[PDB]
Amino acid sequence: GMKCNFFQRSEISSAVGQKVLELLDSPDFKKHL
Amino acid sequence: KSLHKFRILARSRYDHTTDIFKMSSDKFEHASQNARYLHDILQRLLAESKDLTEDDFSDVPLDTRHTIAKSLRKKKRDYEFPEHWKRPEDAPKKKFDIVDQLLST
Amino acid sequence: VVHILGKGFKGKEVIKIALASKFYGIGKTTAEKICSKLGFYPWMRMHQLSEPQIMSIASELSTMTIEGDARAIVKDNIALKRK
Amino acid sequence: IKTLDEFGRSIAVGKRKSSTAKVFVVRGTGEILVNGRQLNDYFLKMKDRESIMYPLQVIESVGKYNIFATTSGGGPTGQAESIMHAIAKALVVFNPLLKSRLHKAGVLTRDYRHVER
Amino acid sequence: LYKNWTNTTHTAQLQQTAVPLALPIFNFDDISKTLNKVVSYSNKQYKSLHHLGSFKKSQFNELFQKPVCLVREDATNSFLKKLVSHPVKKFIITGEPGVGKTVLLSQAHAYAVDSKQIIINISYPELFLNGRNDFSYDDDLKLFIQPMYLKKLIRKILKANDPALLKSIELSKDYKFSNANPKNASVKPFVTLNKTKNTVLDLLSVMTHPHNRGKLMKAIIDELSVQSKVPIMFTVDNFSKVLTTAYSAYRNTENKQIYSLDLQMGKLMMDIISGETKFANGESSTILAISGVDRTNKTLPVALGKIPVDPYVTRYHYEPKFVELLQKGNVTEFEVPKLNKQEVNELIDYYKQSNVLLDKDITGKKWENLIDEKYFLSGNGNPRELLKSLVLSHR
Amino acid sequence: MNVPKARLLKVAELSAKIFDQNFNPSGIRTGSKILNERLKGPSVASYYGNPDILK
Amino acid sequence: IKPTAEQLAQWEALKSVPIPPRKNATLDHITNMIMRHGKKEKAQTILSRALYLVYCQTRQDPIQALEKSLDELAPLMMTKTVIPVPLNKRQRNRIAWNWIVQSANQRVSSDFAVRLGEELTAIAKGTSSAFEKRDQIHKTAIAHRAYI
RNA sequence: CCAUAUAUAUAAUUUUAAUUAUAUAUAAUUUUAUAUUAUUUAUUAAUAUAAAGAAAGGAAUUAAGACAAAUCAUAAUGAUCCUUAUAAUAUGGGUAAUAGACGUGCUAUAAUAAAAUGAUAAUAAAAUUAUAUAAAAUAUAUUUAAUUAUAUUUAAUUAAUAAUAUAAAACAUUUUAAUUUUUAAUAUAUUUUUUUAUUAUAAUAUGAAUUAUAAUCUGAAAUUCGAUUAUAUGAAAAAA
Ligand SMILES: Nc1ncnc2c1ncn2[C@@H]1O[C@H](COP(=O)(O)OP(=O)(O)OP(=O)(O)O)[C@@H](O)[C@H]1O
Ligand SMILES: [Mg+2]
Numbered sequence A: 001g002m003k004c005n006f007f008q009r010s011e012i013s014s015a016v017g018q019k020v021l022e023l024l025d026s027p028d029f030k031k032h033l
Numbered sequence B: 001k002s003l004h005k006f007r008i009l010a011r012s013r014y015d016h017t018t019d020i021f022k023m024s025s026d027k028f029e030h031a032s033q034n035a036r037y038l039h040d041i042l043q044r045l046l047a048e049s050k051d052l053t054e055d056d057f058s059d060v061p062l063d064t065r066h067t068i069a070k071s072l073r074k075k076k077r078d079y080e081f082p083e084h085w086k087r088p089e090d091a092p093k094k095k096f097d098i099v100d101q102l103l104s105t
Numbered sequence C: 001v002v003h004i005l006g007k008g009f010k011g012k013e014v015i016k017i018a019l020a021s022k023f024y025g026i027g028k029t030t031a032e033k034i035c036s037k038l039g040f041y042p043w044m045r046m047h048q049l050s051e052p053q054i055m056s057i058a059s060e061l062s063t064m065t066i067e068g069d070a071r072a073i074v075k076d077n078i079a080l081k082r083k
Numbered sequence D: 001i002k003t004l005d006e007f008g009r010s011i012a013v014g015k016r017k018s019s020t021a022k023v024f025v026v027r028g029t030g031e032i033l034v035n036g037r038q039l040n041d042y043f044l045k046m047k048d049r050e051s052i053m054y055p056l057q058v059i060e061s062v063g064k065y066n067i068f069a070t071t072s073g074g075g076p077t078g079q080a081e082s083i084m085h086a087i088a089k090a091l092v093v094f095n096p097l098l099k100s101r102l103h104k105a106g107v108l109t110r111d112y113r114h115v116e117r
Numbered sequence E: 001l002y003k004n005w006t007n008t009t010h011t012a013q014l015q016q017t018a019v020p021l022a023l024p025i026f027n028f029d030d031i032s033k034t035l036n037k038v039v040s041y042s043n044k045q046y047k048s049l050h051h052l053g054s055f056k057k058s059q060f061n062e063l064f065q066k067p068v069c070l071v072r073e074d075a076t077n078s079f080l081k082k083l084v085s086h087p088v089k090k091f092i093i094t095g096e097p098g099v100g101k102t103v104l105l106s107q108a109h110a111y112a113v114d115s116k117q118i119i120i121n122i123s124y125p126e127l128f129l130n131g132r133n134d135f136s137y138d139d140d141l142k143l144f145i146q147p148m149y150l151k152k153l154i155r156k157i158l159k160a161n162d163p164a165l166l167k168s169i170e171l172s173k174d175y176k177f178s179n180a181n182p183k184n185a186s187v188k189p190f191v192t193l194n195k196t197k198n199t200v201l202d203l204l205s206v207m208t209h210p211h212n213r214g215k216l217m218k219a220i221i222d223e224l225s226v227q228s229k230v231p232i233m234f235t236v237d238n239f240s241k242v243l244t245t246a247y248s249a250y251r252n253t254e255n256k257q258i259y260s261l262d263l264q265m266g267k268l269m270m271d272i273i274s275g276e277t278k279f280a281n282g283e284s285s286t287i288l289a290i291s292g293v294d295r296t297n298k299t300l301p302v303a304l305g306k307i308p309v310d311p312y313v314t315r316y317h318y319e320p321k322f323v324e325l326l327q328k329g330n331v332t333e334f335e336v337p338k339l340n341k342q343e344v345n346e347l348i349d350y351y352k353q354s355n356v357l358l359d360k361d362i363t364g365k366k367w368e369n370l371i372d373e374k375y376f377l378s379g380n381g382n383p384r385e386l387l388k389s390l391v392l393s394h395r
Numbered sequence F: 001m002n003v004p005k006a007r008l009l010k011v012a013e014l015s016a017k018i019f020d021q022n023f024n025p026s027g028i029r030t031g032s033k034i035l036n037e038r039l040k041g042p043s044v045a046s047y048y049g050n051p052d053i054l055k
Numbered sequence G: 001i002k003p004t005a006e007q008l009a010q011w012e013a014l015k016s017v018p019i020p021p022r023k024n025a026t027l028d029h030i031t032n033m034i035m036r037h038g039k040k041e042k043a044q045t046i047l048s049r050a051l052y053l054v055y056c057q058t059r060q061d062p063i064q065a066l067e068k069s070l071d072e073l074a075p076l077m078m079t080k081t082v083i084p085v086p087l088n089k090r091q092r093n094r095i096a097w098n099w100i101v102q103s104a105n106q107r108v109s110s111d112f113a114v115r116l117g118e119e120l121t122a123i124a125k126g127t128s129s130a131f132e133k134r135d136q137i138h139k140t141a142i143a144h145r146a147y148i
Numbered sequence H: 001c002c003a004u005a006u007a008u009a010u011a012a013u014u015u016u017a018a019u020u021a022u023a024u025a026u027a028a029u030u031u032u033a034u035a036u037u038a039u040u041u042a043u044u045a046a047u048a049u050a051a052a053g054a055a056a057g058g059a060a061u062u063a064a065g066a067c068a069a070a071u072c073a074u075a076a077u078g079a080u081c082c083u084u085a086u087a088a089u090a091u092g093g094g095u096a097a098u099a100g101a102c103g104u105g106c107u108a109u110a111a112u113a114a115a116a117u118g119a120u121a122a123u124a125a126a127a128u129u130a131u132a133u134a135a136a137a138u139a140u141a142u143u144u145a146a147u148u149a150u151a152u153u154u155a156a157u158u159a160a161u162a163a164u165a166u167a168a169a170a171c172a173u174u175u176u177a178a179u180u181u182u183u184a185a186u187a188u189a190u191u192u193u194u195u196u197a198u199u200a201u202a203a204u205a206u207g208a209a210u211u212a213u214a215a216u217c218u219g220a221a222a223u224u225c226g227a228u229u230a231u232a233u234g235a236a237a238a239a240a
């Protein structure tokens, strides 16, 4: 088995979060506001 | 002043001994997204470090406690042989051998 | 032979250990706090105590929730659990 | 055949338990450093100091060489005896005729004993 | 014998059987006659040094009839030249553990008795920080006073110093104190000292009640500071315990550990070192001794400028106030260099003459080899560990 | 310690802003660990092998 | 290699000398007997401190005094199950040290070093009850000699 | 084949532990020269002395009998038995109940022994981190700090690189009931962290089970039945 680390010198120049928002919008949580 | 601000805001990401600022990004699915993320964070850090208009981080001493701990978790070989203890007089002295002299001249 | 609230201590006994040892509600921290309040130095001993200081210690201890009162509290709590 | 380096130093490596020691022995006046520290600071136990001394005093050259020892691994006694064995191996270079003498003192033989399961 | 080992040797009078031996007497102006040679303190010096507590336990002083010292060119001569030449005579003695810092302090005291100076020595300042002596709060002196420690210390000052010197210096102003001495306690409530009619020697002999004793100590220190007749050498041994114990073991009414400077002994010591209390003779000096029995902070190294200041070092390991105080006075460090091989030769010679060397050391060993052996075992010159190699190394 | 707390707090807030880090000086339990916790679903479900095998 | 002048002189001078001993066998054996739980340094400290008191109260070499004491106290032979059997140096030293340690433990000091040092001081001055134990063992050996 | 000692190769000595790492190779079952005692008498053993030696340990590897096995959970096949039940799913409980009895370990019963402290950080090895680890910092217990436990926040590392993690005993100082062997007031001293003199001065400051209060960690869930912290408790345990 192999691993290749590449060094590139260069110039200077949310699934759970999505679900939480949906539940908060749902009528089982929004009904408690 | 801008460099000192950069180092202060780097916090644990800056190493004063080696003077290296290192950032690691693996949050996004691909490596290219993480590269863009790191580059953008570097531009933000640089832009607001170069900004000195309403910025007063000169009187904040640089914190190195993280570097102190990291170095404390490693062995050190700082010592070296004393300079005055050296005696070159007793060093081996190369000895003449005519065979190679004639082979080469 | 130093007597405080009907409890006897030997003269050489250190106050902040003896009060914790021979009283129900006082531990190490409580004994240290009492001693600091009364101005006794950390390693003061019973035979050095003057009678006014003994009475002051007795008053301070009496203002605490200790001995029979604390024992009754614990027993009442155990009885309530049993009930 | 071992010989001194450009600075006149004899370099030796010894081992004991999990400890390893690398010693530079030069001609001098009996000064010793361990990990850049004084011998008495690094080695608090007198027995370990005497163990380090023993090969020097077998050839009665104590006070004639300066020792720069560098240890790592194991504990105090292991490091001290590794210094001892390394010092013996380094001393053999300066005068090979004394090797047998050192070999008869028991300081030129590795203590192969180690913790076993 | 009932006490433990260290207190056994210290207090068992085991020097009673020591060899009756004579050595050259120590005097700095005659250092050339005594340079690099083991000496014994003068008879007058022993009486003053013993009261000062210069000779302490664990120093292997029981082997010999009386404690002795080696007048070293690099330790005694070098320091004592500075103590008699430098404009600012504030010094801190440092080095590795057991290198001989106390001995040089004892030698420094011995010079003080020779030059008629008055010595104020605080040995083991932990006595007023451990908490095993009583304390009380004073309000006229907005400070915490410890009568038990003071009463002893006042007596140590008197006996450690010649009455003739204490007789000379005369009181600047009236002092009145509560009186506890038994003939005149009930007869007259107070004792009234007078300007230029009573002297400080009377002050040392005033007996006050425990709470008034706080006034007695500050009166003495201020008096010795104002006068210019006699030099005063304030000396502290085991100083690091003061530096690295910023807060004492005493707690106020609110169970808040009392700060060192809040206590009278703490502020008096730091006032002299910092320089707020100015001794007026001009030859007065402050000598402080580090020790290896105390923990190591970044306080002292920063105070001496050895390392740079790192503000993010916790207060346990760095006390800025002490650094400011020690830097306020121009304190300098004299590091006791370790014994060279030649000095080791001089000491072992005296040990041989005292019959403290073991049989194996003296019989059958080429003398030069022994010096090389014990120079190695000492750690290339540590006096304590050289001495342990001879007397406490049975293997 | 000697350096004031206000300066360090400003430094911490601003640095957290730069590196897309959330700043919570109050110490209140927001529960961000749950949002930042890695998912172990696929590996746990792959315990017995991929279910599509030639039979 | 031809040894140079200094090397050969060193070889001659050294071969004219014996090897130093690594350790004093008797003192090491006594120390190991004091040792428990592998704490060698504690045993060495205790032994050296006791010997230091012995010197300070006698002002003679305490290592020599210890060996005089062990040699004199320890029994040469002992009866075993009943026939006498000879004892070599280590067994004699062990018996003598145990006798010493009992009388030391009978003393008052909280520190074992002080008790041991004062007991050794008393022994070096010819004052010890273990002489009676040695005498009884020797008497039993004399009584049971016939069964060699 | 390990381990050990060496030689060659490899590493641009910043993945640094070159004192290291792993490939190949060599080495030993040690070889010798004498002395003495035995000897099947030397071309032999016991030792001992001298010389060259780094050289001193270890595992595995085969069959034949005989016994024991169903947590034979070390399996297969067969025999027989259930097939609305002896198969299958869910909720809760139990496997932790105590008169007792015996094994196995941990903690103790004090001074050749326990406790506190010891930042330019005394000294290791072998491991582990993509179903993670969690650094430093801030805050609360809590108190100038330190320590210890949680909380907030994720720095690097998916690794000879960073973390788990400053190894601990060791060593130094101090304290430690029984112990009137101690502390305290006066004096005292060439023992001053100390000496002297006169008065005063059977379970502890060992042990931490058990019990109570209030908090905390995991998890959806800690009642039966988990772990952790602090504040109170403080049992048995001494001799043979
Ligand atoms: N010049 C000297 N002459 C004789 N003995 C000496 C000399 N210097 C040191 N010693 C002895 O060496 C030991 C050193 O003790 P000392 O108290 O002086 O050391 P230290 O470095 O101050 O120690 P610590 O850090 O413990 O206070 C004592 O035995 C002392 O007697
Ligand atoms: Mg000292």
Ligand SMILES: [Mg+2]
Pocket (backbone or CB within 6 Å): none
């Ligand atoms: Mg307890």
